[PDB]
């Protein structure tokens, strides 16, 4: 339930936050934040940012309280010199000794009740102000308080967004008055409760709403179905330990008067933050102004300016530069000659800084990319992956003229940089990852890959034979020759061979629907509809079409140029375009023949390297599973060791049947999957499929806890953070329909796996770029988690050292190398 950044302390019409679990949150995350001396400041940093985010909505005042539980030296350290003490480790109580003074300096009050827990204090102050006439809002991070949501009591946070009381009836479906019984059968972190079983794929995560009809665990009921009643009477003294969540009593003896804000002491406020090196982010209280009507200027000194350009087509390599401008101090610097203006500039700074550098490298000019507003908005919200969308949302427009577009890049920097300075996790991703990567992608598009012009023509007649054979197969059946592919003439054959049933909840009735997913469910019976869907997969390449590789070759260089977008994706990968090599059918005899066309120069060789099971390695690092890290530390196979601990057989007695069943779960865990989806891929039944997911969690305990931690930090957070700090704004994780919520959860635990795996590649490409310039090698492609280079034996060993030793992880990374003349000779 809600939360993302620490903070705390109620007051009428203001936030009602808690400061217990919010100190434990920022210690297990954002660990890469330290000073130049050697003082930790990874949790002390969340004070001047969170309380600032809430001050835009504002209210009256804020008070201050501490914890008083049995294990608290780390939690209640926010007032050690005041009152309160208990026992816990020595590594954290030194950091909170810096915030206790900054409390009374902003004009905030204080309160402390020793003996009673912090969770009991919030329940008392919520119901007391309701009777007086004040507006309150419960607010918390830990999954304990949500039952107190009623009239006049709302949901918000200084951390993130807003939720209503009707929004509680959406995903959950339960009422507030009975929400105390929700967490009494779930589990999650801090609460010891092991036992979910299964029965009907619901387990305990999707069963919750059925328990409302006759509780069973608390008062009445004797007999019922398994898993819904079997795990209550079996587990003794386990449910009697789960009542710590229910310990949120509203009847505690406390007076405390609600008063307004005090005078802020700004003389010492800035004195404490400078010793922490964060005394510069105090200029966030100002307002912003930006119009598209700017001034003009000629050519005198335009160093460090924001450029803008006009092209003939969206592809930089073939396009002609029609106009070029610059912006410094709110003035537009127009040019009479486009090709001459490229030599007067130091660096391409502004919108689409990568795409302009590619135009310069063709003419013979080394232009480096600097700052770009496209990458600034990408880190704050992944929905803004357009030069148009960043302008229209934040205040501005995107025209066809270069003079107005150059002046836009100056303003889109002023507004987005202010929001990025308060984010240290995104500044690391902008200085060390994004900006220097723009210099790498610019060279892969400018140089390109050489193709074998004698193979593509021969393949054009080879595949043509496979087409004519399957075309003659449908002509042999049904009798009369007709016009295929056309929806109007396909129904005429279905008139002769009657067989048209329903599909499901996926929208029907229209004319667009009779070309999307029609006949895809009918293949399980008739062979006539199978030789048209197997044909839909045999004849694709560039989906029916075949984009000519020898004709798309530049008349100047002689190589194919592929555009790599740095933003695009949601996870954090580099999506290609012209040609889109991101989605190629692998391990298939069709997609393997397309790679044979991609060769190197007359004396150069292709060195293709691929990340061997990185998506399974990252799963172990973010969880901390002692059994999953064990497989990689030794250097064994993951698909074999999983099936060993599940069935109870040794690693050598594992046959191809059990290794297959384990492979489907190891690839399914990336997006979660379900027992219904697992039953369709394998020959295993519905009731037997549930046991295969349980044996996976019995062998790997911390992995189950991680899914519960991501479901926590997702439905409540709004986004899903990675190891480095990437965002993913999705409010879909709290929906009414079963089809919208399930699709949202599938995207929750999919970004910290596929995104970090892509970020380790992004950070590797930056460190490998200086080493390629001296060795005489170059970078070419980036598909999925594979990097293709062109040099050969000396570079293969150097590239392996950079990719593996990119960041110190808990698991040992392994990369598979491959040297050859072509992409098929190198394989992975």
């Amino acid at each position, epitope marked *: 339930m809600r939360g993302m950044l620490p903070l705390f302390e109620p007051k009428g019409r203001v936030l009602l936050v808690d400061g217990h679990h919010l100190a434990y949150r920022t210690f297990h995350a954002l660990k890469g934040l330290t000073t130049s001396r050697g003082e930790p400041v990874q949790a002390v940093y969340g004070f001047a940012k969170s309380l600032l985010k809430a001050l835009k909505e504002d209210g009256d005042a804020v008070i201050v309280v501490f914890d008083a539980k049995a294990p608290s030296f780390r939690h209640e350290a926010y007032g050690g010199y005041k009152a309160g003490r208990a026992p816990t480790p020595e590594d954290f109580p030194r950091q909170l000794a810096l915030i206790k003074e900054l409390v009374d300096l902003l004009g905030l009050a204080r309160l402390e009740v020793p003996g009673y827990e912090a969770d009991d204090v919030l329940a008392s102050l919520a119901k007391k102000a309701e009777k007086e006439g004040y507006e309150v809002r419960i607010l918390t991070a830990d999954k304990d308080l949500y039952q107190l949501l009623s009239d006049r009591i709302h949901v918000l946070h200084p951390e993130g967004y807003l939720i209503t009381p009707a929004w509680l009836w959406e995903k959950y479906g339960l009422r507030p008055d009975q929400w105390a019984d929700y967490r009494a059968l779930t589990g999650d972190e801090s609460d010891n409760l092991p036992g979910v079983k299964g029965i009907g794929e619901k387990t305990a995560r999707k069963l919750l709403e059925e328990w409302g009809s006759l509780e069973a665990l608390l008062k009445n009921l004797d007999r019922l179905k398994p898993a819904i009643r079997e795990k209550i009477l079996a587990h003794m003294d386990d449910l009697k330990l789960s009542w710590d969540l229910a310990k949120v009593r509203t009847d505690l003896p406390l007076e405390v008067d609600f008063a307004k804000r005090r005078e802020p002491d700004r003389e010492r406020l800035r004195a404490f933050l400078e010793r922490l090196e964060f005394g510069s982010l105090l200029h966030e209280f100002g307002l912003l102004e930006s119009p598209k009507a700017l001034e003009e200027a000629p050519w005198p000194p335009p160093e460090g300016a924001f450029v803008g350009f006009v092209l003939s087509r969206k592809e930089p390599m073939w396009a002609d530069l029609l106009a070029l401008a610059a912006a410094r101090g709110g003035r537009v610097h127009r040019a009479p000659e486009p090709y001459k203006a490229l030599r007067d500039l130091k660096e391409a700074r502004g919108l689409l800084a990568k795409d302009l550098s590619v135009l310069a490298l063709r003419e013979g000019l080394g232009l480096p990319p600097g700052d770009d507003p496209m990458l600034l908005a990408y880190l704050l919200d992944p929905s803004n992956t*357009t030069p148009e*969308g960043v302008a229209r949302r934040y205040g501005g427009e995107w025209t066809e003229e270069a003079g107005e577009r150059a002046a836009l890049s100056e303003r889109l920097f002023a507004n987005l940089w202010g929001r990025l300075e308060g984010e240290e996790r995104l500044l690391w991703l902008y200085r060390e990852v994004e900006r220097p990567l723009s210099a790498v992608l610019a060279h892969m598009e400018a140089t390109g890959v050489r193709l074998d012009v004698a193979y593509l023509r021969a393949l054009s007649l080879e595949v043509a034979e496979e087409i004519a054979r399957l075309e*003659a197969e449908v002509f042999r059946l049904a009798g009369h020759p007709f016009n295929l592919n056309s929806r109007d003439q396909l129904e005429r054959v279905l008139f002769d061979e009657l067989g048209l049933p329903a599909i499901g909840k996926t929208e029907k009735t229209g004319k667009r629907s009779t070309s999307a997913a029609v006949l895809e469910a009918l293949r399980e019976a008739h062979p006539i509809v199978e030789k048209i869907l197997q044909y839909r997969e045999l004849t694709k390449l560039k989906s029916t079409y075949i984009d000519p590789l020898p004709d798309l070759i530049h008349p100047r260089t002689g190589r194919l140029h592929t555009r790599f977008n740095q933003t695009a994706t949601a996870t954090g990968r580099l999506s290609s375009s012209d040609p889109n090599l991101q989605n190629i059918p692998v391990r298939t005899p069709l997609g393997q023949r397309i790679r044979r066309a991609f060769i190197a120069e007359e004396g150069w060789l292709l060195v293709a390297l691929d990340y061997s099971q990185i998506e399974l390695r990252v799963l172990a690092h973010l969880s901390g599973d002692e059994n999953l890290i064990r497989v990689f530390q030794e250097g064994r196979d993951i698909h074999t060791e999983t099936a060993s601990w599940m069935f109870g057989v040794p690693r050598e007695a594992v046959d191809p049947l059990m290794r297959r069943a384990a492979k489907t779960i190891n690839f399914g865990v990336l997006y979660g999957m379900s027992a219904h989806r697992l039953s369709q891929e394998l020959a295993i039944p519905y009731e037997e499929a549930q046991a295969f997911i349980e044996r996976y969690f019995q062998s790997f305990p911390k992995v189950r806890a991680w899914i519960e931690k991501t479901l926590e930090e997702g439905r409540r957070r709004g986004y899903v953070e990675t190891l480095f700090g990437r965002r993913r704004y999705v409010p879909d994780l709290e929906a009414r329909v079963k089809s919208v919520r399930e699709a949202a959860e599938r995207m929750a635990f999919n970004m910290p796996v596929q995104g970090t795996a892509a970020d380790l590649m992004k950070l590797a490409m930056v460190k490998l770029f200086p080493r390629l310039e001296e060795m005489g090698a170059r970078m070419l492609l980036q598909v999925h988690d594979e990097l293709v280079l062109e040099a050969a034996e000396a570079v293969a060993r150097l590239a392996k050292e950079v990719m593996e030793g990119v960041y110190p992880l808990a698991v040992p990374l392994e990369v598979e190398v491959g040297i050859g003349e072509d992409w098929l000779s190198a394989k992975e």
Partner: antibody
Amino acid sequence: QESGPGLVKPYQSLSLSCTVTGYSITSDYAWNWIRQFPGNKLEWMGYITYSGTTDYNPSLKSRISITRDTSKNQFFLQLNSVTTEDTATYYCARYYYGYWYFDVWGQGTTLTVSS
Amino acid sequence: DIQMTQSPAIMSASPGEKVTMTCSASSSVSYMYWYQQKPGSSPRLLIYDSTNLASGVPVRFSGSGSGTSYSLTISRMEAEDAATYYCQQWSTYPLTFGAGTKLELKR
């Protein structure tokens, strides 16, 4: 299904929306926008990917705006300063990508700009 | 932006005849897209880049063209082939479609 107004006044802002069910706008596929009629000559307006937007519209980018609402599972369209120069009859197309091609195509809806 | 023009517009053919239509551009064009649309339906695929046939498509249909002009040629006509055809490209283009070759049936 194309939902919106049947009539619009000059120099105003247009608001359209194509609803989708079953396959969400977060799994895969890019959703395009293309018009036709009366001269039977078509024109592009751009697309909208599963991740966000990623669109790169034609020379007339100062008027067209593409946005979306993932919670309701639909994508909006906003054409500012709509005049009589607009041909009209909007279709909601879709790109596949990885391997590019147009297959499906929208309904139609005949909208006219008049006073 | 390049201009797409389909020659001709309206034309009719009897079942069994040889049909031919062309799509031309202003500059050096590489590869073409071909479509089909019946009265009261959505437009779909038919023939692809330069020559070969798509997912399905009868053996009587055939493509040709390289350079400035790309054409479609049908060897055997039937009563179900009468519809409107369109052309597009994605080489040196930000993608836009043609005029429309409305093919009708002769009786």
